[PDB]
Amino acid sequence: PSMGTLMGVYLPCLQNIFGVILFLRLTWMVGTAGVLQALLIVLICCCCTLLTAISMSAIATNGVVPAGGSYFMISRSLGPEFGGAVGLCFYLGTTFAAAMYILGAIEILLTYIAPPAAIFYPSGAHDTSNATLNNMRVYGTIFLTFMTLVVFVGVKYVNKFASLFLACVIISILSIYAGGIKSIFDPPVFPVCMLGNRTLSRDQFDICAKTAVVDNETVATQLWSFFCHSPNLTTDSCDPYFMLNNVTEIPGIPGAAAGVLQENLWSAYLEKGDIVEKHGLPSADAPSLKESLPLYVVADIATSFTVLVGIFFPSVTGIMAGSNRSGDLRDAQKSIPVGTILAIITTSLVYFSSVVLFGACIEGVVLRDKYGDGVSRNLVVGTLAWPSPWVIVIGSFFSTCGAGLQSLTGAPRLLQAIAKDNIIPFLRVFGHGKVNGEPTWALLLTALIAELGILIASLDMVAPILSMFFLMCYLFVNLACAVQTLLRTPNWRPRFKYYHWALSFLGMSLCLALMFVSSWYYALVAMLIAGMIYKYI
C-alpha cells in the first residue's frame, strides 16, 4: 500500500463532487433565488456534508480501517444493522445518480450541440414538453444500453481514462474564471431584445426592430409580422401591449460592476407560465393576445425555496466515494480525515465564488433563462467563457459522460460486496460474477434500476430523489456515530481531535430538516417505513 493523501483521497473526492449541476442549473438558481438566498442554500447544503465528514473521520480514526471500499469500515466498526442500511442507500443513490448524469448529457447534446438530432418534434402550438419527454426517453435508453455494455467489456479502459474526465472539469472551471475576470475590462457582446418588461425569444425572428428601412422605404419587420398577423403598417389587430410599448436592445453581459450585483441581489420567483421581466424599465399596462405567448421567455417549472434546495443538493454529495481506496493508503487514518475535509472546503469555496461571480457579471434575465432561450440558444454559463463557449459545452458533455460511466462501474461493486457478505440472503444470487472478480448479474440490476430514473425524463425531477436517498445515507451515518457514543459500547474509541457527540446530533437534525425541505411527501413515507421497522425489532 503506497498511496499519498493527494492522489489517494483528495483527487477521487474532487472528481466525484464536481459534475453536471454547476454547468446546467447554477445560473438559473442564482437568477431565480437572488445572490443572498443562493449563498444561504450553499451554506446550508455544505453543513450536512461537513458534519457527515467529521463523523466519517470518527469512523476512520478507530480500529484497523479494513481494506477495500468504504462499506467494510462501517460494517466492521458499527455492526451489520447500520452497515447494511448505509450500503443499500448509498447503492440506490449511486444508481440514480447514473440516470441523472445521462439525462444531463442528453440535455446538453440536444439543446446545444446538435439541435436537428431530434426524433420527436413539437406538433401543434403548445405542448413542447411532452415531445421533449419522449425525446429524452429514447436517447436515454440508447445511451444506457451503450454504457452498460462498455462497462461490461472495458473496465480497464474506464479506469485508465479516469483522469481525463477530471482534467476536462478543471479546464472548464478555469475558462469560466478567466472570462469572468476579463469581463471587468472588455465584456463580450450578446444582445438581448426586449419589449417593455417582457423579454422575447430571439430564435424565431431575424432583426430586433419594430420597423426597418429597405430600399429607401420603411417596411414592417418580421417581428411586426409575428405580433400583428399582417405585414401592413396601419392595422389595428395588434395587441395593445405591442402598441403601447417599445422594443429595446440591452447588453446581456454588461460587465462586472456594483450596479449589476445590486440588481440581482433579491429573489424573483415565478409561477409556471409567467414571463421573465426586469424591474427598472418603462412599461405601459395593456392586455396581450394569447397567440403571441410563445414569442416570449416563459418559466418552465414552478420555483420556490424547497424546489431549489432539492435540485442543488447532489452537487455536494460524493464524500463516501473518497474512501474506496482505503486499503491502498499508507496511513489510512490520516489521509482520509484530512483529505475529505480539504476536498469539501475547496469545492464549497468554488461554489461560493461562482455564485458571487455569476451574480456580479451576468444580468439576471439571462440568468433566468433555463435552456438559454433569451440568447441564441447558447449556454448562459458559456457566454462567460473566455476562448469560446464550446469549451464549456464539450467539457460538460465529457464530464457528465465520465461521471455516468464511473457511477455504473462503482455501484455493482458495492452490491457485490453486500451480496458476498451474506448479511441478506435475499440478494444472495448477486454474489455471482466473472472469473476476474467483475460482477455479472448486478450490472443488469443497476441497469434496470437506473432505467426507471431515465423514464422520468427530466433533470429537475430526478434530482430530488437523489437528494432523498443521499440524505437518508448521511442521516444513518450520523445516527450510528451518535448512538454508539451515547450507549457506551466497547470497541468504539474515536481517536480524532475535533469529535464530539453534539456535532453528530447537529448533523442528524440538519440532514433530517433538509429531508423534509426537499420533498416532504416521500420523506413522510420513509418516516413511516422506518418507524414500522423500528416497531418490529
Ligand X SMILES: *[C@@H]1O[C@H](CO)[C@@H](O[C@@H]2O[C@H](CO)[C@@H](O)[C@H](O)[C@H]2NC(C)=O)[C@H](O)[C@H]1NC(C)=O
Ligand Y SMILES: C[C@@H]1CC[C@@]2(OC1)O[C@H]1C[C@H]3[C@@H]4CC=C5C[C@@H](OCCC(CO[C@@H]6O[C@H](CO)[C@@H](O[C@H]7O[C@H](CO)[C@@H](O)[C@H](O)[C@H]7O)[C@H](O)[C@H]6O)CO[C@@H]6O[C@H](CO)[C@@H](O[C@H]7O[C@H](CO)[C@@H](O)[C@H](O)[C@H]7O)[C@H](O)[C@H]6O)CC[C@]5(C)[C@H]4CC[C@]3(C)[C@H]1[C@@H]2C
Question: Which positions make up the binding site for K(+)?
Answer: 16-17, 101, 314, 317
Which grid cell sits at 226?
A: 409575428
> Which residues are CB-contacts of 167 (< 8 A; sequence separation ≥ 6)?
none
- Least separation in angstroms between residue 536's CB and a copy of itself is 5
Residue 319 binding partner per list a copy of itself, Cl ion, ligand X, none, with a CB distance cut-off of 5 to 8 Å that depends on partner kind: Cl ion
- Least separation in angstroms between residue 244's CB and ligand X is 6
User: How big is the site for ligand Y, counted in residues (CB under 6 A)?
Assistant: 22
Distances (CA, A) of 447 to 133, 146, 456: 20, 11, 15
Residues 120, 133: contact at Cβ < 8 Å?
A: no
> Which residues are CB-contacts of 463 (< 8 A; sequence separation ≥ 6)?
21, 100, 310, 311, 313, 314
Give the separation between CA 58 and CA 61, rounded to whole angstroms: 5
Beta strands in 164-236 (DSSP E): 191-195, 198-199, 211-213, 218-220
Residue 282 binding partner per list a copy of itself, ligand X, ligand Y, none, with a CB distance cut-off of 5 to 8 Å that depends on partner kind: ligand X
User: How big is the site for Cl ion, counted in residues (CB under 5 A)?
Assistant: 4
Selection from 310, 263, 266 nearest residue 25 by Cα: 310
Distances (CA, A) of 17 to 12, 181, 347, 446: 9, 25, 7, 21
Residues 52, 481: contact at Cβ < 8 Å?
A: no
DSSP string, 101-153: HHHHHHHHIIIII-TT--SS---SSS--SHHHHHHHHHHHHHHHHHHHHHHHH
Instruction: Please state the residue numbers annotated as binding site.
Output: 16-17, 101, 314, 317-320, 474
Q: Which of 230, 288, 458, 509 binds ligand Y (CB under 6 A)?
A: 458
- Least separation in angstroms between residue 133's CB and ligand X is 23
Residue 271 binding partner per list ligand Y, Cl ion, a copy of itself, none, with a CB distance cut-off of 5 to 8 Å that depends on partner kind: a copy of itself
Considering only residues 292-331, where is the footprint of Cl ion by CB under 5 A?
Answer: 317-320
Q: Which of 219, 243, 452, 533 binds ligand Y (CB under 6 A)?
A: 452
Give yes or no for residue 52 binding Cl ion (CB under 5 A). Answer: no
- Least separation in angstroms between residue 247's CB and ligand X is 8
Give the separation between CA 148 and CA 262, rounded to whole angstroms: 48
Give the separation between CA 306 and CA 303, rounded to whole angstroms: 8
Residue 532 binding partner per list ligand X, ligand Y, Cl ion, none, with a CB distance cut-off of 5 to 8 Å that depends on partner kind: ligand Y
Give the separation between CA 359 and CA 389, rounded to whole angstroms: 19
Give the separation between CA 208 and CA 425, rounded to whole angstroms: 67
Considering only residues 193-252, where is the footprint of ligand Y by CB under 6 A?
Answer: none
Closest to a copy of itself by CB, 266 or 520: 520
Residue 245 binding partner per list ligand X, a copy of itself, Cl ion, none, with a CB distance cut-off of 5 to 8 Å that depends on partner kind: ligand X
Residues 355, 46: contact at Cβ < 8 Å?
A: no
- Least separation in angstroms between residue 20's CB and ligand Y is 17
Residue 127 binding partner per list Cl ion, a copy of itself, ligand X, none, with a CB distance cut-off of 5 to 8 Å that depends on partner kind: a copy of itself
Considering only residues 70-99, where is the footprint of ligand Y by CB under 6 A?
Answer: 88, 92
Q: At 85, is the secondary structure helix, strand, or coil?
A: helix
Q: H helices of 362-500, where?
A: 364-367, 390-420, 441-454, 459-486
Residue 197 binding partner per list ligand Y, ligand X, a copy of itself, none, with a CB distance cut-off of 5 to 8 Å that depends on partner kind: ligand X
- Least separation in angstroms between residue 95's CB and ligand Y is 8
Considering only residues 518-537, where is the footprint of ligand Y by CB under 6 A?
Answer: 519, 521, 525, 528-529, 532
Residues that bind ligand X (CB under 6 A): 196-197, 245-246, 277, 279, 282-285
Phi, psi angles (nearest 5°) of residue 194: -135, 170
Residue 164 binding partner per list ligand Y, ligand X, a copy of itself, none, with a CB distance cut-off of 5 to 8 Å that depends on partner kind: none
Closest to ligand Y by CB, 29 or 92: 92
Give the separation between CA 159 and CA 319, rounded to whole angstroms: 19
Residues that bind a copy of itself (CB under 8 A): 126-127, 229, 236-237, 239-240, 271, 273, 287-291, 293, 426, 429, 448-449, 452, 455, 521, 524-525, 528, 535-536
Closest to ligand Y by CB, 36 or 528: 528
Q: Which of 131, 170, 461, 483 binds ligand Y (CB under 6 A)?
A: 461
- Least separation in angstroms between residue 186's CB and ligand Y is 39
- Least separation in angstroms between residue 309's CB and ligand Y is 12
- Least separation in angstroms between residue 505's CB and a copy of itself is 27
Going by their DSSP bridges, the two strands 198-199 and 191-195 should be labelled as antiparallel
Q: Which residues bind Cl ion (CB under 5 A)?
A: 317-320
Q: Which residues bind ligand Y (CB under 6 A)?
A: 88, 92, 133, 272, 301-302, 307, 449, 452, 455-456, 458, 460-461, 464-465, 519, 521, 525, 528-529, 532
